[PDB]
mmCIF file of C-alpha atoms and ligand atoms in Angstrom:
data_model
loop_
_atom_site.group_PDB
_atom_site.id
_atom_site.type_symbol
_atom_site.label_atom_id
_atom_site.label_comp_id
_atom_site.label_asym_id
_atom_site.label_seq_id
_atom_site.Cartn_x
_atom_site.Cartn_y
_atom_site.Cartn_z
ATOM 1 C CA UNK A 11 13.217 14.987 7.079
ATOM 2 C CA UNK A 12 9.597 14.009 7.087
ATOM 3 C CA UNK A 13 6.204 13.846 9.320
ATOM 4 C CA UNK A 14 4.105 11.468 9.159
ATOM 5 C CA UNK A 15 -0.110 11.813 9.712
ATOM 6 C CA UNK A 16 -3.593 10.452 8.811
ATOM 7 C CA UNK A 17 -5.062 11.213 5.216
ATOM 8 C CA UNK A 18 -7.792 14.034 5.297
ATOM 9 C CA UNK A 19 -10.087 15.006 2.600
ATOM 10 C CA UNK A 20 -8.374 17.863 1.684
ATOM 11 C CA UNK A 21 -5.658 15.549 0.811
ATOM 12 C CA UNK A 22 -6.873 13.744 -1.561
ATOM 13 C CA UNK A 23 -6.573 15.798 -4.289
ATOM 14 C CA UNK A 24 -2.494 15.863 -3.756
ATOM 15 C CA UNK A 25 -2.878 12.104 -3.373
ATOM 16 C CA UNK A 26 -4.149 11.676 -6.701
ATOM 17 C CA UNK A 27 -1.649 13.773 -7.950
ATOM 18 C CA UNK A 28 0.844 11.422 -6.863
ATOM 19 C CA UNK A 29 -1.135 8.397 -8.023
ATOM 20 C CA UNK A 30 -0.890 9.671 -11.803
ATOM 21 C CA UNK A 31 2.325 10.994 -11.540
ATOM 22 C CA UNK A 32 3.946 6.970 -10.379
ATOM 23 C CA UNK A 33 1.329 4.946 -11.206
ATOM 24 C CA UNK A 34 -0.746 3.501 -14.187
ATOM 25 C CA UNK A 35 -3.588 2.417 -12.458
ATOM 26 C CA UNK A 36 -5.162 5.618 -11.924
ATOM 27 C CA UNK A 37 -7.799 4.882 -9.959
ATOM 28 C CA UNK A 38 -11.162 7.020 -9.617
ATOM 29 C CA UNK A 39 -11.265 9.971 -7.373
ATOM 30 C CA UNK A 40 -14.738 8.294 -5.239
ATOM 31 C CA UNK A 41 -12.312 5.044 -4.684
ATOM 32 C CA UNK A 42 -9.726 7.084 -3.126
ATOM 33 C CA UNK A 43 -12.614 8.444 -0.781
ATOM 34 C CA UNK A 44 -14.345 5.238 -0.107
ATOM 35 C CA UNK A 45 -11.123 3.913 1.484
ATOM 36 C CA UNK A 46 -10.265 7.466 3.506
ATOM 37 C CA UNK A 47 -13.895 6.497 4.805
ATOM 38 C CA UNK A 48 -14.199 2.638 5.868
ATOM 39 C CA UNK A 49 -10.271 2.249 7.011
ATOM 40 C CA UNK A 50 -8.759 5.516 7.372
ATOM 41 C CA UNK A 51 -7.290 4.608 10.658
ATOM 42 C CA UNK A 52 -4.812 2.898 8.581
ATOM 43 C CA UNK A 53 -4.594 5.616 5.755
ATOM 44 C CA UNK A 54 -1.265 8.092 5.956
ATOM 45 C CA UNK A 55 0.009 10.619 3.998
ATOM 46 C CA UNK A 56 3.790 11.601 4.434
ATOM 47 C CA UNK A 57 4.536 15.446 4.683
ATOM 48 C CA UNK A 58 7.223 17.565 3.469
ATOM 49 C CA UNK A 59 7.209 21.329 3.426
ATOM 50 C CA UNK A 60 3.597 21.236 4.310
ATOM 51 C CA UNK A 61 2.340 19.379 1.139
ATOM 52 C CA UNK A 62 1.698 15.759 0.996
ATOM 53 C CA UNK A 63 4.442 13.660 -0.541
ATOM 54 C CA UNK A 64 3.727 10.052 -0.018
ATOM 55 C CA UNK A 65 0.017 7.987 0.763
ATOM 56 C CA UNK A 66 -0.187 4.331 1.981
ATOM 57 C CA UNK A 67 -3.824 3.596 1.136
ATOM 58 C CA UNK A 68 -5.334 0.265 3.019
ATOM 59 C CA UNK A 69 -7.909 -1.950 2.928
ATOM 60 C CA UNK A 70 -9.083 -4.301 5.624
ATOM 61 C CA UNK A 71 -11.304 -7.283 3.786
ATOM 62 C CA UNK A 72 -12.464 -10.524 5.641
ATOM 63 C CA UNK A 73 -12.157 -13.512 3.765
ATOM 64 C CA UNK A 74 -9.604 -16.692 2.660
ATOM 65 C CA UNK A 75 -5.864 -15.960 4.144
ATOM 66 C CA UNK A 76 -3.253 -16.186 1.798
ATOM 67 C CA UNK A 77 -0.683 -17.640 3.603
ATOM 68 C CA UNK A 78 -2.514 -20.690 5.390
ATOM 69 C CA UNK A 79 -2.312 -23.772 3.486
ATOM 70 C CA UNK A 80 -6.041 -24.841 3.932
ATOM 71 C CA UNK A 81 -8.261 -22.499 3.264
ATOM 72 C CA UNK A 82 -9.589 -20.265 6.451
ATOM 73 C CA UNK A 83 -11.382 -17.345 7.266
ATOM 74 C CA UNK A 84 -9.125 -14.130 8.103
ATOM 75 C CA UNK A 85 -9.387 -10.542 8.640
ATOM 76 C CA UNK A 86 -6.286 -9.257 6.141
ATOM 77 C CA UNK A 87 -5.095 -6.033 5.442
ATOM 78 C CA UNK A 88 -4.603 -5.254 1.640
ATOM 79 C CA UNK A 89 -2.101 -2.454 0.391
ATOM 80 C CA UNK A 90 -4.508 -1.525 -2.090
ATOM 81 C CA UNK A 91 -1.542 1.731 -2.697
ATOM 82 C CA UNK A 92 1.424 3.199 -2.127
ATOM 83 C CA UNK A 93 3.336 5.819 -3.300
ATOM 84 C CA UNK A 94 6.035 8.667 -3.091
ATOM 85 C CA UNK A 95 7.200 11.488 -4.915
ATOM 86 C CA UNK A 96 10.352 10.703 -7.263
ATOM 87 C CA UNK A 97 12.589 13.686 -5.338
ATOM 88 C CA UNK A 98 11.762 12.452 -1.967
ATOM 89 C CA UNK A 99 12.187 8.870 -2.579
ATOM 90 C CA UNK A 100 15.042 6.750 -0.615
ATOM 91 C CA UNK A 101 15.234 8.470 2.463
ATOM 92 C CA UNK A 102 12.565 5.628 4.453
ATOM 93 C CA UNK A 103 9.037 7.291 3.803
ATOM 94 C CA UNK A 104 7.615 4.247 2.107
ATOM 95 C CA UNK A 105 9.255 2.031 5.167
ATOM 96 C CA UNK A 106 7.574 4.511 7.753
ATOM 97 C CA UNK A 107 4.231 4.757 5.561
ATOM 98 C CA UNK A 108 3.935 0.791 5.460
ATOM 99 C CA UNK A 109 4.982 0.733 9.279
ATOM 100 C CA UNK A 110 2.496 2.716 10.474
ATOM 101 C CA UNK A 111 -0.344 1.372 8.345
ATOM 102 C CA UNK A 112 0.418 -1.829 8.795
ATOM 103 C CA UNK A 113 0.566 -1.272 12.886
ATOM 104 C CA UNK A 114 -2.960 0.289 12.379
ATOM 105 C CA UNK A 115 -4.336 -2.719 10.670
ATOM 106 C CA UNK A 116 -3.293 -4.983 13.501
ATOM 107 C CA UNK A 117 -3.986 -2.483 16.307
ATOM 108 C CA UNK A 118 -7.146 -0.381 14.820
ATOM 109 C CA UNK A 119 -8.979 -3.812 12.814
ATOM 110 C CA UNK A 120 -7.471 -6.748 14.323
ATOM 111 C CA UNK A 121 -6.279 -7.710 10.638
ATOM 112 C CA UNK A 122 -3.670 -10.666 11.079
ATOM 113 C CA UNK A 123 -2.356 -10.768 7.765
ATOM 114 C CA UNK A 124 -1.310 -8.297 5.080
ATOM 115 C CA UNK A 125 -0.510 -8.522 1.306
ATOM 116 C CA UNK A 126 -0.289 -6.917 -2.163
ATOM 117 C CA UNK A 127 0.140 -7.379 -5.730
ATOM 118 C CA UNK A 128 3.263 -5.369 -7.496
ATOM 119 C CA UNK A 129 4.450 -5.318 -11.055
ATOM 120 C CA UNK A 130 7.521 -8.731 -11.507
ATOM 121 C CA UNK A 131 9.857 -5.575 -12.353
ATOM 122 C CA UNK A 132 9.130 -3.446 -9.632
ATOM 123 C CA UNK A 133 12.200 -3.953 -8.122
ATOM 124 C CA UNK A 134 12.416 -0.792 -5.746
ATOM 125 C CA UNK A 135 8.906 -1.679 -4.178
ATOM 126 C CA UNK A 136 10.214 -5.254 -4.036
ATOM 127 C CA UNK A 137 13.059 -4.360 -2.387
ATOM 128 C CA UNK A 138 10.752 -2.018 0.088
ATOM 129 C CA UNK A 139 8.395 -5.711 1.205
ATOM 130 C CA UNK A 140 11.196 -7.823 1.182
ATOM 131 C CA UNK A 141 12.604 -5.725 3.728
ATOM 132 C CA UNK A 142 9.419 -5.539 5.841
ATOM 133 C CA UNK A 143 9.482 -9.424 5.836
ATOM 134 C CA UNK A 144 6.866 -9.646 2.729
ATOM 135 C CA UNK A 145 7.301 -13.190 0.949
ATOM 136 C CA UNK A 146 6.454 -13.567 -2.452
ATOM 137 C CA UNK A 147 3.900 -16.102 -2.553
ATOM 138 C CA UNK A 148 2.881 -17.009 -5.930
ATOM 139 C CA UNK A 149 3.094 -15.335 -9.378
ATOM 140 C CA UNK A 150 -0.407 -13.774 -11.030
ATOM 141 C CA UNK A 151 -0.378 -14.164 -14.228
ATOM 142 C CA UNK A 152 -0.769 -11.424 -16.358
ATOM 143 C CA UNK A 153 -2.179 -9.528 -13.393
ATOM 144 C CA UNK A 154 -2.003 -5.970 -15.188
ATOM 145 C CA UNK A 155 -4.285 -4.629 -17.932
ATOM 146 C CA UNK A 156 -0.872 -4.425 -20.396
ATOM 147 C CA UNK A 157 -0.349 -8.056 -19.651
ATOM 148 C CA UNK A 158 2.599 -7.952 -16.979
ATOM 149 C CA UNK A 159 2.708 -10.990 -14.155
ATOM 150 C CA UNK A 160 2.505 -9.757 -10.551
ATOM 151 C CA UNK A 161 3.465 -11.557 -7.186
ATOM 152 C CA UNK A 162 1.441 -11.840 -4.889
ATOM 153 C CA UNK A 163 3.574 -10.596 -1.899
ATOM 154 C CA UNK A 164 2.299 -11.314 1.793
ATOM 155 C CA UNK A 165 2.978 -11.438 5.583
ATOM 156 C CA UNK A 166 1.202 -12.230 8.790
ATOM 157 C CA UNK A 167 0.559 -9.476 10.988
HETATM 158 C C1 ACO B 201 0.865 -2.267 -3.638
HETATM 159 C C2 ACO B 201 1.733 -1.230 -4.231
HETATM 160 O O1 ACO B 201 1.012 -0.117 -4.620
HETATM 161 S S1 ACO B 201 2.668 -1.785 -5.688
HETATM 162 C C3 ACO B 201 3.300 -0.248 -6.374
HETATM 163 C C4 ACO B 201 4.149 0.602 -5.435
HETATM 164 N N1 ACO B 201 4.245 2.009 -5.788
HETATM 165 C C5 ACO B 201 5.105 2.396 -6.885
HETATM 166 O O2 ACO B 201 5.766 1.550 -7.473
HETATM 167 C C6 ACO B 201 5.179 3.887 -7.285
HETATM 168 C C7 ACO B 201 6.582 4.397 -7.735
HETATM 169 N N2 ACO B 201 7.651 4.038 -6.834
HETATM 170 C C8 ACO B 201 7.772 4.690 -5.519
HETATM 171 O O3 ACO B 201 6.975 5.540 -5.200
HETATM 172 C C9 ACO B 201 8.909 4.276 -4.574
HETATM 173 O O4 ACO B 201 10.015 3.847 -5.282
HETATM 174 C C10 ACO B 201 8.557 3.192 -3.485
HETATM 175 C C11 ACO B 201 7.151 3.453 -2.929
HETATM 176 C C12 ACO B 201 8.591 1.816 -4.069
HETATM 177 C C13 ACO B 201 9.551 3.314 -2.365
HETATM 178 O O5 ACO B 201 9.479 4.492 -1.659
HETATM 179 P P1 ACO B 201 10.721 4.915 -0.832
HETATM 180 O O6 ACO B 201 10.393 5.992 0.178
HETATM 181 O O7 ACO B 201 11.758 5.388 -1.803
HETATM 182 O O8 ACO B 201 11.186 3.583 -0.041
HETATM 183 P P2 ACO B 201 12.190 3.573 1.232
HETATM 184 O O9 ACO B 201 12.987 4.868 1.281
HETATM 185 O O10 ACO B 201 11.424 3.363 2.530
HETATM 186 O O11 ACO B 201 13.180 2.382 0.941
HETATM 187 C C14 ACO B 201 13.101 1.145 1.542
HETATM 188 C C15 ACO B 201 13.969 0.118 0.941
HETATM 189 O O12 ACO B 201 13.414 -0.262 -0.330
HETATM 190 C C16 ACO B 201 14.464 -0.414 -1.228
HETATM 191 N N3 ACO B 201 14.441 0.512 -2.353
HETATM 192 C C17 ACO B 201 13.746 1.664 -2.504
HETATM 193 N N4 ACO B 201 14.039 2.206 -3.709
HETATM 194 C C18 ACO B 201 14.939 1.381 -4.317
HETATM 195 C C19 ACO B 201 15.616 1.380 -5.535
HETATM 196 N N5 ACO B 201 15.415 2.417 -6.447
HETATM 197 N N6 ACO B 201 16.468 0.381 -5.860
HETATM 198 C C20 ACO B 201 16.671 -0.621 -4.996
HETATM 199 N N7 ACO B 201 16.053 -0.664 -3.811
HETATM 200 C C21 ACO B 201 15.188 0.314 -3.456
HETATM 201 C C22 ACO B 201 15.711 -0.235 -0.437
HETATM 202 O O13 ACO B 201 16.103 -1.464 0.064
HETATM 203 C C23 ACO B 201 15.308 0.620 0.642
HETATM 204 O O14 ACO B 201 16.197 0.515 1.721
HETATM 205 P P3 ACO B 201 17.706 0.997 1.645
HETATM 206 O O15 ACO B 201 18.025 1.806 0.416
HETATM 207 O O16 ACO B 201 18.001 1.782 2.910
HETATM 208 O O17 ACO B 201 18.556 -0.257 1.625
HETATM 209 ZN ZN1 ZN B 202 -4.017 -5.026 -4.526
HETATM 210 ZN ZN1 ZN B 203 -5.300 3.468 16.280
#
C-alpha cells in the first residue's frame, strides 16, 4: 500500500530524483521550491517504505479559463507535474496524488478549473485524466523542445 502527505523541503531532493528518472523536462531545483512555497497546500508526495515515491506538483495562476468559450477571468489550477516511480506504478498513486491536489486547489485556492499539457503518446498519463474526467481540449503544436504535439487536457473544478 501507500500514504499519502504534503511535500516538505527535505523532500525535494527525492522529488527531483524522480523528475529525472521519468521525465525530460528536468526542471531546476529553485522551481521545484518556488512551487513547495506559493501552493504547497496542493503539493503531495506519495510514500512507500518511508521514502517518497510519487509528487503531484501544482500551480494555482489567475487568468483566461480554458474551457469557457469567451474569454473570462478564472482562478485555475495547473498540473505543472506529476510523477511515480516505475516499480510502484499501477496500483492508484497517481489517481490519489491528482485527487488530493486537485481537492486542495478547489478547497485551499478557490481554483475552479484545472488543466495540463502531456506528450500525444503519453498514453498511461492519458489514460490517468481521462479517467479523472480531463477532456482533451485542443492539440499544441509542437509543444516540447524535441518537437512532439501536446493536448491540452482540462476540467472544471
Ligand atoms: C502534467 C503531467 O506532468 S504530464 C507527464 C506525466 N508524468 C509522466 O508521464 C512520468 C512517467 N509516468 C508515470 O509516472 C505514471 O505512468 C503515471 C503518473 C502516468 C501514472 O501513475 P500511476 O500511479 O501508475 O497511475 P494510476 O495507478 O493511478 O492509474 C490510473 C489509471 O491510469 C491508467 N494507466 C496508468 N498506467 C497505464 C498504462 N501503463 N497503460 C494504460 N493505462 C494506464 C489506467 O487506466 C489506470 O487505471 P486502471 O489500470 O485501474 O484501469
Ligand atoms: Zn503545464
Ligand atoms: Zn486545505
Amino acid at each position: 500500500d501507500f500514504t499519502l502527505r504534503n511535500a516538505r523541503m527535505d523532500d525535494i531532493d527525492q522529488i527531483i530524483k524522480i523528475n529525472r528518472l521519468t521525465l525530460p523536462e528536468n526542471y531546476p531545483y529553485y522551481f521545484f521550491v518556488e512551487h513547495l512555497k506559493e501552493y504547497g497546500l496542493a503539493f503531495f508526495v506519495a510514500i512507500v517504505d518511508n521514502s517518497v515515491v510519487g509528487y503531484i506538483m501544482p500551480r494555482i495562476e489567475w487568468g483566461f479559463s480554458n474551457i469557457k468559450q469567451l474569454p473570462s477571468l478564472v482562478r485555475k489550477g495547473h498540473v505543472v507535474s506529476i510523477a511515480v516511480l516505475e516499480e510502484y506504478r499501477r496500483k492508484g498513486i497517481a489517481t490519489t496524488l491528482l485527487e488530493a491536489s486537485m481537492k486542495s486547489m478547489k478547497n485551499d485556492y478557490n481554483a475552479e478549473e484545472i488543466y495540463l499539457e502531456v506528450r500525444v503518446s503519453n498514453y498511461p498519463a492519458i489514460a490517468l485524466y481521462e479517467k479523472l474526467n480531463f477532456k482533451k481540449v485542443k492539440v499544441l503544436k509542437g509543444y516540447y523542445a524535441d518537437g512532439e504535439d501536446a493536448y491540452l487536457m482540462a476540467r472544471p473544478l
